[PDB]
From a paper:
LTA4H (EC 3.3.2.6) is a bifunctional zinc-containing enzyme that catalyzes the conversion of the labile LTA4 epoxide to the pro-inflammatory and immune-modulating lipid mediator, leukotriene B4 (LTB4). In addition to the epoxide hydrolase activity, LTA4H also catalyzes the peptidolytic inactivation of a chemotactic tripeptide, Pro-Gly-Pro (PGP). The elucidation of high-resolution crystal structures of LTA4H revealed the binding mode of LTA4 and PGP in the L-shaped substrate channel with overlapping active sites. The channel can be divided into two parts: the wider polar region containing the substrate entry site and catalytic center, and the narrower hydrophobic tunnel accommodating long fatty acid tails.
In the current project, new inhibitors, 4-(4-benzylphenyl) selenazol-2-amine (TTSe) and 4-(4-benzylphenyl) oxazole-2-amine (TTO) were synthesized based on the lead compound, ARM1. Specifically, the sulphur atom in the thiazole ring of ARM1 was replaced with other chalcogens, namely selenium or oxygen, resulting in the selenazole and oxazole derivatives, TTSe and TTO, respectively. Similarly to ARM1, TTSe and TTO bound to the end of the hydrophobic substrate channel and interact with the polypeptide chain of LTA4H via hydrogen–hydrogen interactions. In addition, the hydrophilic moiety of TTSe and TTO was coordinated by two water molecules connected with the peptide bonds of A377 and S379 from one side or D312 and W315 from the other side. The hydrophilic selenazole or oxazole ring can rotate via a single C-C bond; therefore, densities of two rotamers are detected. TTSe and TTO-bound LTA4H structures are in a closed conformation which is in accordance with stabilizing conformational changes observed with DSF. The binding of inhibitors results in the conformational rotations of Y383 and Y378 which together with catalytic Zn2+ coordinate the substrate for efficient catalysis. The Ki values for ARM1, TTSe and TTO with LTA4H were 1.5, 4.8 and 3.8 µM, respectively. Similarly to ARM1, TTSe and TTO did not influence the cleavage of the PGP tripeptide by recombinant LTA4H. In addition, it should be noted that ARM1 and TTSe do not affect the activity of recombinant soluble epoxide hydrolase (sEH) activity, whereas TTO at higher concentrations may affect metabolism of fatty acid epoxides.
Numbering used by the authors: 4 to 610
């Protein structure tokens, strides 16, 4: 049972296919159309079924060419409203029918952000993009909005002819709209079954550049050249990922660089990974996010979590593969450096939530929890830490990678639970069951807080970061003169970020130390978003009033939640910036992504 879905479960009926025909109306901020669901009964004498919806207007439901009865239930908060459909003829087990639902979305759809021309790079055209994970697909179309059900899909999308539509699917042509010569229809096919959280749409003034044999980058024209360079390692990462995971089954691997309000670093929409433009550091240094989205083509998109309580299966295995791709490209010492950084992010999340908090468990219970409120680094890093621990326990990365490949092959096209994973781990490692039974499974999977054992990490690349951080933390006023730009000369961007992260873990530092850091290191000049984020948090938490306009600008000029939520929270916690933080939120809230708007409002206690 999926506690986040109000739809008929997969034991009752299963959507096999969606045919979406829709029109994007930027004047009304609506998507209007038909969703034709091919549904297979899983029981005898099926006479009704229930779909998820959220803020959808339903015009009619058509089966066998006639309108049928349907009823929308009372709204259940973030879950939306269940839609019960009375079938005209009882179905036997395995019988399939087509249900055609005529619907329109709400301008406030939590799946969608509608941008005005002034919010875009080009300033002439508007822009739309979706983000369905976890349970926002129901705010675009009626569906069994659960990852326990996988379907293929086809779509035809009518847009103003000056604009381009793309989806999480193979492009299947474009024509003038035969109903309206001011519009174009773009067609799409997704022939690999997916959970519906992977459906995605973008409409805007998009251009493409080829960067590899199976990859185009898409953005507004102003970002194409920088994006092509930034993501040039993509084909190399795809080849490594195929070596680790088995064949790439999805045909194309395109990248779409969204406007700056995209809420996440990336989203693994099949055939078309969506990425934040905050990756555009100019030196490819944030390419781990691409390695992570590539990895999801296996762990998440092929093997899927059955319910959101088991989300760690998706993210932990993806971080694990991501860090192997980066280790194959840049060395094993680098993989251990990134692994140890992730432990630090886990320490931070556990300290923030508290060590007894239920969202620090690996397997969570999202009954009556908004999944967007539970989202954190925990499933990423506690999930990675478990796999990295098991790697060490079971004989190292070569051996554990054999398990990963076999796991993907076993559960390809399926939706699974933690128990399914664990049973297969035990089956695969049958000759090492004595080692597996040493694991404290109850603590790792079901207990809050830090895991009960910390893995072993190579320290080679970390040591200079720790040493410099400790020099600053232990410095007194009379030591500040000893710091110099030469301190950084042998540090990569990754090490500078880790130096900041280590130092931020001990924040605040005295204001004179932070002033001295700017004087000698000129961190205000650095445009790398991860470095800048941690530098600005360090400054604000250390009560540097000069950093307030910089922090407010970064919090509002982009909307990646990783950056925006903690910058707003730091600014609200500094008495000198509190009022500006709340005022700035209130002035921007109407033109924010709807999920970001909600979560920053929760964080700032501003309703
Ligand atoms: N260990 C652990 N898992 C979670 C968790 C589970 C599911 C989700 C849903 C979600 C929401 C938004 C975007 C992507 C996924 C979030 C967190 C927490 O702790
Ligand atoms: Yb029957
Ligand atoms: Yb075709
Ligand atoms: Yb039409
Ligand atoms: Yb078993």
């Amino acid at each position: 049972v999926d506690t986040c879905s109000l739809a008929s479960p997969a034991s009752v009926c299963r959507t096999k296919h969606l045919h979406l025909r829709c029109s994007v109306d930027f004047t009304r901020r609506t998507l209007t159309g038909t969703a034709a669901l091919t549904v297979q009964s899983q029981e005898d004498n099926l006479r009704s079924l229930v779909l998820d919806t959220k803020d959808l207007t339903i015009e009619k439901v058509v089966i066998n060419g006639q309108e049928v009865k349907y009823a929308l239930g009372e709204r259940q908060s973030y879950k939306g409203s269940p839609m019960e459909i009375s079938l005209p003829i009882a179905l036997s087990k395995n019988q399939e029918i087509v249900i055609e639902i005529s619907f329109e979305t709400s301008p406030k759809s939590s799946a969608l952000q509608w941008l005005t021309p002034e919010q875009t790079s080009g300033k002439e055209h508007p822009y739309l993009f979706s983000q369905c994970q976890a349970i926002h697909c129901r705010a675009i179309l009626p569906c069994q909005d659960t990852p326990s059900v996988k379907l293929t899909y086809t779509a035809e999308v009518s847009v103003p002819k000056e604009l381009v539509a793309l989806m999480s699917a193979i492009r299947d042509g474009e024509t003038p709209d035969p109903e309206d010569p001011s519009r174009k229809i773009y067609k799409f096919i997704q022939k690999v079954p997916i959970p519906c959280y992977l459906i995605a749409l973008v409409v805007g003034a998009l251009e493409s550049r080829q960067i590899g044999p199976r990859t185009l980058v898409w953005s507004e024209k102003e970002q194409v050249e920088k994006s092509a360079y930034e993501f040039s390692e993509t084909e190399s990462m795809l080849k490594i990922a195929e070596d680790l995971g088995g064949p790439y089954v999805w045909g194309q691997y395109d990248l779409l660089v969204l406007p700056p309000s995209f809420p996440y670093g990336g989203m693994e929409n099949p055939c078309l990974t969506f990425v934040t433009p905050t990756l555009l550091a100019g030196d490819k240094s944030l390419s781990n996010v691409i390695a992570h989205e590539i990895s999801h083509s296996w762990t998440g998109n092929l093997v899927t979590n059955k319910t959101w309580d088991h989300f760690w299966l998706n993210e932990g295995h993806t971080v694990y593969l991501e860090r192997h791709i980066c280790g194959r490209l840049f060395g094993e010492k680098f993989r251990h450096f990134n692994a140890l950084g992730g432990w630090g992010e886990l320490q931070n999340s556990v300290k923030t939530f508290g060590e007894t908090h239920p969202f620090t468990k690996l397997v969570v219970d999202l009954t009556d929890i908004d999944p967007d409120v539970a989202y954190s680094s925990v499933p990423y890093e506690k999930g990675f830490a478990l796999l990295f621990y098991l790697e060490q326990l079971l004989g190292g990365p070569e051996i554990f990678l054999g398990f990963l490949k076999a796991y993907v092959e076993k559960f390809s096209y399926k939706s699974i639970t933690t128990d399914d994973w664990k049973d297969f781990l035990y089956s695969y490692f049958k000759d090492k069951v004595d080692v597996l039974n040493q694991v404290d499974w109850n603590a790792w999977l079901y207990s809050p807080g830090l895991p009960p054992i910390k893995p072993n990490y190579d320290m080679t690349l970390t040591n200079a970061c720790i040493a410099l951080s400790q020099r600053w933390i232990t410095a007194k006023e009379d030591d500040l003169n000893s710091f110099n730009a030469t301190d950084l000369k042998d540090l990569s961007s990754h090490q500078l970020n880790e130096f900041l992260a280590q130092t931020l873990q001990r924040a605040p530092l005295p204001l004179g130390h932070i002033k001295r850091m700017q004087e000698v290191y000129n961190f205000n000049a650095i445009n790398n978003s991860e470095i800048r984020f941690r530098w600005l948090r360090l400054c604000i938490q250390s009560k540097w009033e000069d950093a307030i306009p910089l922090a407010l600008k970064m919090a509002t000029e982009q909307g990646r939640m990783k950056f925006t939520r903690p910058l707003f929270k730091d600014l609200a916690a500094f008495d000198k910036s509190h009022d500006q933080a709340v005022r700035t939120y209130q002035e921007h809230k109407a033109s924010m992504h709807p999920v970001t708007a909600m979560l920053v409002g929760k964080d700032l206690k501003v309703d």
